[PDB]
Amino acid sequence: HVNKVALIGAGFVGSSYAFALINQGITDELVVIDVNKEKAMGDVMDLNHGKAFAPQPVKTSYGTYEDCKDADIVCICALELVEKNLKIFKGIVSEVMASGFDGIFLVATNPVDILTYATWKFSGLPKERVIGSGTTLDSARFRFMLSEYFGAAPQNVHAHIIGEHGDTELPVWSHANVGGVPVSELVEKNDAYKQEELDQIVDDVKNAAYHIIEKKGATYYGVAMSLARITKAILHNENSILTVSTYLDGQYGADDVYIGVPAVVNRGGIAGITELNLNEKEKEQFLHSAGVLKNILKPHF
Amino acid sequence: KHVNKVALIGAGFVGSSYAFALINQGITDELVVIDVNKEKAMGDVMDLNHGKAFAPQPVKTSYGTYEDCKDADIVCICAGANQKPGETRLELVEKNLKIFKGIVSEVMASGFDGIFLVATNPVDILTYATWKFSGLPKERVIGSGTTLDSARFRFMLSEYFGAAPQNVHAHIIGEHGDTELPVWSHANVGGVPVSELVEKNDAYKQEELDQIVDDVKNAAYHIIEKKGATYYGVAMSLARITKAILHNENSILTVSTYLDGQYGADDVYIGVPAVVNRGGIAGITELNLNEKEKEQFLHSAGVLKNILKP
Amino acid sequence: HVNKVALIGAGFVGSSYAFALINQGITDELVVIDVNKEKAMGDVMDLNHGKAFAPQPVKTSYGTYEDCKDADIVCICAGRLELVEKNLKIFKGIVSEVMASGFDGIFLVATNPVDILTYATWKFSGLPKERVIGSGTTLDSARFRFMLSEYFGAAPQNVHAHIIGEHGDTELPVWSHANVGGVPVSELVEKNDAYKQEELDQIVDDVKNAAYHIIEKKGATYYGVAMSLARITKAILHNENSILTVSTYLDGQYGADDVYIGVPAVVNRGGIAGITELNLNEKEKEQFLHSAGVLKNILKP
Amino acid sequence: HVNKVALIGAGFVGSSYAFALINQGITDELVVIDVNKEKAMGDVMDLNHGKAFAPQPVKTSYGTYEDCKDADIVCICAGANQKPGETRLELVEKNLKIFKGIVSEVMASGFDGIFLVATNPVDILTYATWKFSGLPKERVIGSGTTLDSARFRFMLSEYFGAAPQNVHAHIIGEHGDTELPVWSHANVGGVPVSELVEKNDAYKQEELDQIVDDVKNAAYHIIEKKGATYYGVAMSLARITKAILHNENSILTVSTYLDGQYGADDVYIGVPAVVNRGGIAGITELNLNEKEKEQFLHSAGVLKNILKPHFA
Ligand SMILES: NC(=O)c1ccc[n+]([C@@H]2O[C@H](COP(=O)([O-])OP(=O)(O)OC[C@H]3O[C@@H](n4cnc5c(N)ncnc54)[C@H](O)[C@@H]3O)[C@@H](O)[C@H]2O)c1
Ligand SMILES: O=P(O)(O)OC[C@H]1O[C@@](O)(COP(=O)(O)O)[C@@H](O)[C@@H]1O
Ligand SMILES: O=P(O)(O)OC[C@H]1O[C@](O)(COP(=O)(O)O)[C@@H](O)[C@@H]1O
């Protein structure tokens, strides 16, 4: 009867994701599902022990796929490691579908873009109901670094990373800005004394994953938060512009591929999609980026 | 300078969840993460800070050292060893007492003039030692105490009775540990005492609630076996205390607080209901414990004496 | 699909309530229905305008009865010779329409006499009694709790005390269970000095009077009720199981039945889900029979 | 030690402002100040009566000037409102005499926070709270064109189909008739609104002008409908307050002193600013086109005049 979210696989991401939910109050319900029943169950005990202090307390309980019949979102947090996740994914989607599930999919495990489309196959529901991290975290990583660079609130910083999530991302420097003044127009005062520091900031973003991963072993708080953000926009029908994994079909010259761009999100899922008036470099970059992703698909299917 | 700042010390699992909970709830305007292992701390600053753009309540999170505790409004200590499966408590205490020794000296040497918030286990004893080491008043040194254990009790009572954790009112008190006791005598669901509720079933209600108590004391053991540690509960718990503190709440929480005579106990840091606010402790909630409960509460504070003396 | 409340009556009360959700983000959407379009529309436009700068995006709109069809909650705050006979007439129609609208959710009444109109509401509706709820004594209990909080130096969230019976001037405190942090007020008056119990009865005399006192000063009372209604609505939409002293129907419970009266009750998505029956004392038992009498002798005609 | 806001003026705006805070938990303390002790004190009473059911319990008290000593923000909502028959300069005259006593008494109590003026016409009274008070310009802040902006964003969210947070479009100028959109930068999700009607020319590009003359007419409109406006300004005053209490470095079209910018100076007027615990941290200078240029200076021209009879 109320906002329910089934979350598949309680790893570091699924956990952090789950704890963000606890603290922000986005859903009323959460059920944690894992093969590692041990690691899930214990999660549902620790989390529930903060309930009496949660400003927006969630009913957190564990279960198995029989409980996702009514679930309104399933979040998925479960080299050639690809097919492994695929055996895992198809090994895991088939279970939820039989349950009675008729909601909207949400996925976060790398390689997200691949695994999103991979998820679109096994499922068989309108392409407006499968989603993935896309470049939100990278947009948010880009915002953060641009807020620290320009010294204005991140939310007052507007700049997308777009494309797939990996070795081929790109900045939309064109319509990037701070409070409605374009990034370009900001540097215009000092010829390259910004410019290249901002191009370095591009690399800090592209690299930040590896960096964090080198420092504390993995990455999880960030995606947890972006996860939570996408969720909110969905449950509470926001019509919010996020850079999720959206199925294009003509947009940015590409078709037959889940990619990260500015997609509107609401109760349904992907609602509209913004085609951005890009440019050669970025268009080419996106086009090329749209490239590698098309490849990796065919055979593994 | 003019705005709420939390210094966290020790970015293991515990402190990092506590920093994340804060990142999500927005209790403080600023958070400084310090830990001798620079790698993990600055590695954690980056990861939290990247969520910023999607966080509701705005927090500047940086890396810092002890000197940055200068204008901290609060220092939260979550650092120090875990109790290895062999050793005793007195043993762990020895080892954690030399950690807290180094830490507090530096904290104080920075110029810090705030409030201490202790997570390290056993937290009662280690709150006692922050008070003595630091020089500060017993009102400005607080440990999570039995807050977690009550929120734990609160929840289990909650689901078993079908009412919100917020509407269920019962304390676990004394020790964060094995000799902890429920104040059944004052407990209730919307004001209707629990003892009157169980009427409905004998050999069906009255001892399931005993299992519930059992489930609370050894909840920390059941969690560790099932994933490794425990951090999400102590996270909320700690966060609840910062909020109550930073927002000058005059809220009532069962933290570790200095008793000098209350409850039949003194010269000990123990868990009892306290009024928490901008200064720390402001008042002590004197329960009328029944026979069974005063007796148990004495065993609990004596045992904390068992370690404080040596 | 998403949380929807339909407020009927955009006076000072209905208008303040809307502002509370629009500030707390309790709901996803709200529709504002009033016998007066140029007031209700102004209200609607004044809210939505601050949407850009608000916590949770709430969508607000002007409308009429037909819009209730899918509302999870209709909240009614619409209202010399008899006040009661009038509003009875007014509810009969208001309720009449939303019944015929198809609306199959939950009624929340606020208009005074809140207990009678919740009784009447229920009468006109034919919905199960558990789905018909008045703001009961929850505004009284809250006033009582701010007051003891100012008295005992503890926070309102930690002062536990019920007002029960009719919302009005035969309302009674439940001292036998009033407590701060778990410690009874009885004990706390064993501290203090000269002046305890005497000033406590002033506090209780001030809770009967607060309405009368705010009106003397500002012609109407609206903030506190907004905050009451806003909290019941919360308990309902997010299914929290909240003990609140709403106006509710009685099964003999408390030695009186058939009436709608302010008592502690378990509120969730389904409505009322259990009456908390407290163990009253000699005094309390009788003050409560005299309240229930007066109320059930207003109904008869 | 804790966040304290002083509200001077418990009218429709003041009270609504207090109710937003009491529902949003942005301040820790609020004291309401008002020579009408009955109203002021009636609001404190009704607002406290909700305290138990607040998610972020605020502390509210009735007080007076002496209680602004430790306040972080003084919010002025005290003032007369314009009678249809009287000129704006008649309104100002009346309002400036109230401000001088208000701003004089606040200062003599030991206050040293940031002023935040809402009373109309805000920019004039902002300047006068500045002059009267002799504080740094950065710490006298006016409500500016923040609501005008907020409306300008609501209407544009309903016309373009995306969340008001996704919509970016400043109104700037004086908070009144001579204000103006900044179409040159306006943009949904980053894409310029020019690029959005590029597909749908003028049939659209006159719908927007309508959206603008309604932004420019919402005041009178709501004032004709529900009898008075106030919820909107409340959410603006709350947002600004929130950015200063929590040290946001957020951008808001607030009224500010410009020292040369936009060809204007010695004048408070509404432009985008960086706002924090110090007040105005910076002044957001956007590259305006020729038209936006011309309208801005003229709007500056109106304020300057009203100011002159006390410009010395
Ligand atoms: N964009 C990013 O930089 C970002 C950040 C962090 C993580 N991720 C992705 O999220 C994933 C999770 O990362 P993590 O740190 O939690 O690693 P993890 O292994 O600890 O978590 C994955 C969890 O999935 C669960 N799981 C594994 N196989 C399963 C199965 N077949 N059925 C059900 N559950 C199963 C396990 O409990 C495991 O803990 C990673 O694979 C990573 O690619 C992306
Ligand atoms: O629309 P974007 O660029 O994705 O940004 C979303 C964030 O931007 C905002 O700061 C709006 O930015 P502006 O007010 O500076 O135009 C917030 O409303 C929101 O959280
Ligand atoms: O968590 P605590 O410390 O037991 O207090 C929880 C609060 O919620 C309540 O259940 C609300 O109920 P009351 O109206 O009886 O006060 C109160 O008992 C108390 O004020």
Side-chain angles (χ1 to χ4, degrees):
Chain A
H1 224 312
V2 284
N3 271 346
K4 184 164 106 179
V5 164
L7 144 56
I8 294 286
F12 293 86
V13 183
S15 233
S16 293
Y17 166 75
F19 203 38
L21 283 171
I22 292 315
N23 282 267
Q24 300 190 43
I26 301 177
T27 179
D28 315 282
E29 281 200 47
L30 184 62
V31 152
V32 177
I33 289 174
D34 202 314
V35 33
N36 190 355
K37 137 150 190 168
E38 215 81 337
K39 170 95 176 64
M41 160 56 170
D43 249 355
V44 177
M45 225 173 326
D46 206 3
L47 302 172
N48 267 6
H49 298 169
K51 195 177 171 176
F53 298 142
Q56 295 276 14
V58 175
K59 166 149 186 53
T60 313
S61 59
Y62 142 95
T64 195
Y65 300 89
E66 69 195 32
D67 302 291
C68 316
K69 167 186 164 59
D70 39 2
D72 300 321
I73 288 188
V74 169
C75 205
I76 316 188
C77 283
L79 281 148
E80 316 142 329
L81 68 175
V82 187
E83 155 138 332
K84 307 188 63 180
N85 289 357
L86 285 162
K87 238 57 167 54
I88 289 182
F89 266 68
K90 187 210 184 67
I92 239 185
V93 186
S94 329
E95 320 295 333
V96 28
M97 290 311 294
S99 78
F101 185 72
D102 192 39
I104 311 82
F105 276 108
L106 174 75
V107 187
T109 321
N110 277 340
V112 51
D113 316 76
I114 322 297
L115 303 182
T116 311
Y117 190 87
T119 308
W120 182 90
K121 296 302 192 196
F122 314 143
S123 53
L125 309 102
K127 68 207 206 298
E128 309 83 87
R129 296 164 52 178
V130 199
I131 336 161
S133 165
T135 79
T136 52
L137 177 52
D138 326 75
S139 284
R141 279 159 169 172
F142 194 34
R143 310 274 219 91
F144 167 74
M145 305 188 193
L146 289 173
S147 167
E148 290 297 314
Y149 185 90
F150 296 97
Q155 289 86 14
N156 292 151
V157 166
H158 316 272
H160 313 277
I161 296 311
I162 42 160
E164 88 199 41
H165 179 106
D167 265 79
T168 77
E169 78 178 9
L170 87 105
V172 197
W173 287 110
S174 309
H175 302 278
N177 71 99
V178 180
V181 340
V183 41
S184 60
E185 278 198 341
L186 286 166
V187 311
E188 302 173 352
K189 286 309 169 238
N190 39 50
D191 317 304
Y193 131 65
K194 319 283 85 173
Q195 272 289 359
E196 44 191 13
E197 306 238 63
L198 300 157
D199 268 339
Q200 158 84 315
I201 279 161
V202 185
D203 185 53
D204 293 72
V205 171
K206 169 181 172 180
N207 293 9
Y210 176 66
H211 251 197
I212 302 168
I213 293 176
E214 210 170 332
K215 273 160 156 67
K216 68 167 161 98
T219 278
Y220 42 57
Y221 291 137
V223 68
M225 300 275 273
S226 39
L227 298 211
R229 180 67 190 91
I230 294 159
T231 310
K232 197 164 170 258
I234 292 162
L235 286 180
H236 300 266
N237 189 61
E238 310 201 306
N239 300 317
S240 169
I241 295 152
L242 296 165
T243 72
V244 296
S245 202
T246 170
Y247 188 98
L248 297 190
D249 237 337
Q251 289 88 18
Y252 296 83
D255 54 64
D256 219 317
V257 64
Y258 264 108
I259 208 156
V261 308
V264 172
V265 197
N266 66 308
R267 189 58 193 77
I270 340 293
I273 335 183
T274 307
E275 230 279 25
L276 273 162
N277 200 16
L278 275 193
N279 57 26
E280 257 59 22
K281 183 178 185 166
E282 296 154 4
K283 194 189 304 184
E284 210 160 333
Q285 271 178 5
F286 189 84
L287 273 141
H288 173 27
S289 186
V292 197
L293 219 178
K294 299 230 230 156
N295 250 334
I296 332 248
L297 297 185
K298 257 66 152 50
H300 308 90
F301 286 64
Chain B
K1 192 194 295 77
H2 234 290
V3 303
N4 281 352
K5 180 166 85 166
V6 184
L8 160 75
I9 292 168
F13 288 86
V14 173
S16 284
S17 317
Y18 162 77
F20 193 52
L22 295 189
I23 251 54
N24 271 320
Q25 274 186 44
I27 296 144
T28 198
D29 292 329
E30 296 178 12
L31 168 48
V32 196
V33 179
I34 298 152
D35 199 330
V36 290
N37 179 348
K38 334 266 244 173
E39 275 24 70
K40 169 77 141 79
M42 64 185 182
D44 255 331
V45 166
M46 316 180 302
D47 192 31
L48 286 193
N49 254 335
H50 299 163
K52 217 193 181 160
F54 293 145
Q57 290 281 56
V59 197
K60 168 200 126 61
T61 311
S62 69
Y63 180 87
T65 44
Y66 294 119
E67 264 123 18
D68 294 324
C69 291
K70 186 183 159 87
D71 52 3
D73 299 85
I74 298 179
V75 176
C76 185
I77 292 165
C78 306
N82 304 319
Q83 182 176 22
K84 296 193 57 185
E87 75 198 333
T88 65
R89 285 163 97 235
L90 181 59
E91 261 146 30
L92 187 59
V93 167
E94 218 59 32
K95 299 181 67 179
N96 277 338
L97 290 192
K98 213 68 156 308
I99 302 181
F100 275 65
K101 215 122 152 38
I103 289 176
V104 175
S105 331
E106 282 299 276
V107 189
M108 300 311 299
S110 78
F112 170 78
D113 230 327
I115 305 172
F116 282 103
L117 178 39
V118 169
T120 331
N121 264 323
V123 40
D124 300 305
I125 300 299
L126 283 156
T127 302
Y128 196 91
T130 297
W131 177 52
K132 258 294 192 287
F133 285 148
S134 88
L136 293 171
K138 65 207 183 178
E139 272 84 54
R140 278 162 55 186
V141 202
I142 299 184
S144 33
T146 57
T147 57
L148 174 46
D149 311 59
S150 291
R152 271 166 176 174
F153 192 18
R154 288 246 258 170
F155 161 74
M156 288 160 183
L157 292 181
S158 169
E159 280 233 23
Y160 180 94
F161 282 118
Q166 270 69 11
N167 297 102
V168 200
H169 319 279
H171 312 273
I172 296 297
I173 59 175
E175 156 184 51
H176 181 51
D178 294 329
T179 69
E180 73 186 20
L181 65 140
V183 185
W184 283 118
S185 57
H186 292 252
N188 52 118
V189 160
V192 299
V194 60
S195 91
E196 319 187 14
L197 290 176
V198 315
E199 248 64 350
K200 318 322 148 215
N201 323 312
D202 188 331
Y204 292 124
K205 289 200 85 157
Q206 221 303 304
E207 103 266 6
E208 286 196 41
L209 291 172
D210 287 292
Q211 188 55 287
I212 288 187
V213 166
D214 172 18
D215 290 326
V216 175
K217 167 175 58 121
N218 302 284
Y221 165 79
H222 292 166
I223 292 180
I224 286 172
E225 98 201 324
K226 276 182 152 67
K227 52 173 166 111
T230 194
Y231 39 90
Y232 293 143
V234 43
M236 321 288 293
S237 262
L238 282 180
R240 174 88 197 80
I241 309 256
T242 297
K243 174 165 157 304
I245 294 213
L246 289 186
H247 297 151
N248 166 349
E249 249 185 31
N250 287 305
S251 243
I252 291 177
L253 301 176
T254 65
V255 286
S256 301
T257 123
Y258 191 99
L259 292 168
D260 230 11
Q262 301 88 348
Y263 285 85
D266 75 323
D267 211 350
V268 77
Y269 255 90
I270 206 178
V272 295
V275 169
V276 184
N277 77 41
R278 193 59 200 84
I281 324 295
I284 276 163
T285 283
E286 262 306 279
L287 308 155
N288 186 4
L289 304 162
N290 68 15
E291 299 159 83
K292 207 157 184 173
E293 294 154 348
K294 350 180 176 178
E295 194 167 346
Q296 309 185 283
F297 185 87
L298 292 167
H299 170 65
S300 209
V303 168
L304 289 164
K305 300 268 185 170
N306 278 12
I307 300 190
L308 281 176
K309 271 56 168 72
Chain C
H1 236 314
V2 295
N3 294 308
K4 179 172 175 172
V5 164
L7 163 70
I8 309 171
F12 265 126
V13 170
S15 171
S16 306
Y17 166 79
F19 203 42
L21 320 157
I22 265 56
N23 282 284
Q24 296 178 54
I26 285 164
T27 195
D28 291 297
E29 32 173 6
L30 154 76
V31 50
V32 184
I33 304 176
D34 197 301
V35 143
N36 170 6
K37 159 142 99 178
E38 231 54 82
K39 178 58 167 68
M41 208 145 187
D43 260 356
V44 175
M45 315 193 301
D46 211 9
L47 314 189
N48 280 291
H49 279 164
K51 201 163 151 175
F53 292 144
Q56 309 269 81
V58 187
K59 170 168 173 70
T60 309
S61 61
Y62 180 49
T64 197
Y65 301 129
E66 71 197 38
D67 306 275
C68 296
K69 204 165 83 70
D70 53 338
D72 330 61
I73 283 165
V74 173
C75 178
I76 317 184
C77 317
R80 302 76 190 163
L81 276 151
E82 202 63 315
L83 234 290
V84 178
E85 205 55 43
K86 310 174 183 179
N87 298 317
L88 280 166
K89 211 98 167 65
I90 288 197
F91 265 56
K92 202 146 185 56
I94 284 178
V95 164
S96 184
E97 321 263 4
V98 323
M99 297 319 292
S101 79
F103 159 88
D104 189 46
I106 303 192
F107 276 107
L108 174 56
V109 178
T111 328
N112 298 320
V114 65
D115 309 283
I116 308 296
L117 301 177
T118 294
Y119 192 89
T121 296
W122 169 64
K123 273 312 196 205
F124 314 140
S125 43
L127 295 181
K129 19 179 270 290
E130 277 100 59
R131 290 163 48 182
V132 172
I133 308 168
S135 49
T137 47
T138 84
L139 172 55
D140 304 282
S141 301
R143 286 172 166 146
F144 193 28
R145 302 218 258 136
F146 166 77
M147 255 144 188
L148 294 177
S149 161
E150 292 293 311
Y151 199 70
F152 287 131
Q157 290 63 20
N158 302 127
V159 170
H160 325 263
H162 295 299
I163 308 267
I164 75 183
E166 167 204 32
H167 177 123
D169 308 293
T170 77
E171 67 191 354
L172 50 135
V174 187
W175 279 128
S176 59
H177 278 316
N179 68 77
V180 182
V183 15
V185 61
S186 322
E187 296 200 30
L188 291 168
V189 303
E190 307 177 51
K191 197 57 186 303
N192 239 312
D193 263 354
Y195 292 120
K196 63 177 172 61
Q197 260 294 3
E198 24 201 346
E199 349 183 271
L200 282 184
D201 288 63
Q202 202 55 32
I203 290 177
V204 157
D205 154 69
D206 295 42
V207 169
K208 257 187 53 189
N209 275 352
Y212 184 91
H213 253 249
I214 301 169
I215 301 178
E216 149 184 53
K217 305 190 175 53
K218 61 168 237 170
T221 315
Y222 41 89
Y223 294 138
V225 52
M227 293 297 281
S228 284
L229 305 178
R231 149 133 225 111
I232 319 177
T233 291
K234 193 176 176 282
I236 295 175
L237 294 189
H238 309 288
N239 200 44
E240 314 176 321
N241 293 323
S242 252
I243 301 196
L244 294 158
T245 86
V246 289
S247 192
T248 141
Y249 193 89
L250 307 177
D251 202 0
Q253 287 139 319
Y254 288 108
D257 51 330
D258 191 76
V259 41
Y260 256 106
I261 205 166
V263 294
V266 168
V267 184
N268 58 44
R269 182 64 184 97
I272 302 287
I275 300 179
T276 290
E277 191 185 33
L278 310 122
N279 195 12
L280 296 183
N281 64 24
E282 234 59 10
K283 182 178 157 190
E284 298 160 0
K285 288 184 181 273
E286 166 172 35
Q287 307 179 317
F288 193 85
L289 296 182
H290 171 57
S291 197
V294 168
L295 286 185
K296 212 183 57 180
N297 246 294
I298 282 198
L299 305 183
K300 254 53 197 72
Chain D
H1 250 3
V2 311
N3 284 326
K4 196 181 181 190
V5 173
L7 169 58
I8 302 187
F12 284 121
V13 181
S15 282
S16 294
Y17 174 65
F19 195 47
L21 302 169
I22 267 74
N23 286 267
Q24 277 173 55
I26 300 166
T27 185
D28 291 297
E29 309 206 0
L30 179 69
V31 56
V32 176
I33 304 183
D34 206 321
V35 70
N36 186 357
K37 41 147 290 212
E38 248 58 63
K39 177 64 162 63
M41 193 173 194
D43 284 334
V44 171
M45 217 174 333
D46 200 10
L47 287 160
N48 271 335
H49 291 174
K51 179 157 188 200
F53 299 138
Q56 301 275 39
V58 175
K59 171 175 150 73
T60 311
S61 59
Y62 189 39
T64 183
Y65 301 103
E66 66 208 49
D67 295 297
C68 311
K69 182 169 188 307
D70 51 20
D72 314 288
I73 287 157
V74 172
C75 181
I76 312 170
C77 294
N81 288 296
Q82 194 176 3
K83 299 143 43 59
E86 96 182 338
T87 73
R88 187 148 66 125
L89 188 49
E90 269 147 2
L91 167 61
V92 190
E93 235 60 56
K94 276 153 143 187
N95 267 351
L96 289 168
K97 181 71 53 59
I98 285 154
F99 270 50
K100 213 248 161 46
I102 284 169
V103 173
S104 184
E105 299 289 32
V106 47
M107 297 307 303
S109 81
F111 170 70
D112 208 43
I114 294 174
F115 277 110
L116 175 64
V117 181
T119 300
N120 290 298
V122 56
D123 313 81
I124 315 305
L125 291 153
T126 299
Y127 191 90
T129 299
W130 171 52
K131 227 49 186 168
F132 287 161
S133 83
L135 290 181
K137 40 209 211 305
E138 296 72 44
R139 311 208 335 250
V140 184
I141 300 179
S143 83
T145 52
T146 51
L147 179 62
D148 314 273
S149 296
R151 304 167 178 152
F152 185 43
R153 285 218 246 163
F154 173 57
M155 298 176 173
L156 285 181
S157 82
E158 298 286 293
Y159 186 91
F160 285 111
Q165 283 84 44
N166 298 144
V167 185
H168 316 281
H170 303 289
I171 300 284
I172 62 183
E174 172 212 59
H175 164 67
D177 261 337
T178 62
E179 63 188 30
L180 64 121
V182 188
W183 293 111
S184 54
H185 312 244
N187 67 81
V188 175
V191 7
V193 69
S194 76
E195 273 199 1
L196 279 178
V197 312
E198 183 256 35
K199 193 172 72 77
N200 304 240
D201 1 276
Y203 300 151
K204 295 303 179 67
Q205 263 290 314
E206 70 209 53
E207 314 246 88
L208 300 178
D209 273 14
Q210 183 77 328
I211 288 189
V212 176
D213 244 74
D214 291 335
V215 176
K216 177 178 164 191
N217 281 347
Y220 167 77
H221 283 150
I222 301 162
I223 277 171
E224 199 182 283
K225 264 149 201 45
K226 79 176 182 71
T229 174
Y230 46 85
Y231 290 132
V233 78
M235 300 301 279
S236 260
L237 295 161
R239 173 70 192 85
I240 300 157
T241 293
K242 185 176 154 314
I244 315 172
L245 287 197
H246 298 308
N247 199 101
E248 233 146 308
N249 300 302
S250 277
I251 296 179
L252 301 154
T253 48
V254 275
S255 158
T256 124
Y257 197 104
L258 307 170
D259 209 10
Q261 292 104 342
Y262 304 95
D265 84 5
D266 191 18
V267 52
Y268 278 86
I269 195 180
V271 293
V274 203
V275 167
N276 75 31
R277 217 329 202 171
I280 308 306
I283 297 181
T284 310
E285 273 222 296
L286 339 84
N287 202 12
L288 299 178
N289 66 35
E290 277 79 321
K291 192 164 183 184
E292 295 155 350
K293 265 208 266 272
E294 102 212 314
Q295 298 153 328
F296 195 88
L297 290 288
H298 171 77
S299 177
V302 153
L303 300 154
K304 305 285 296 163
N305 277 358
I306 315 171
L307 296 165
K308 213 63 197 171
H310 348 243
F311 237 166

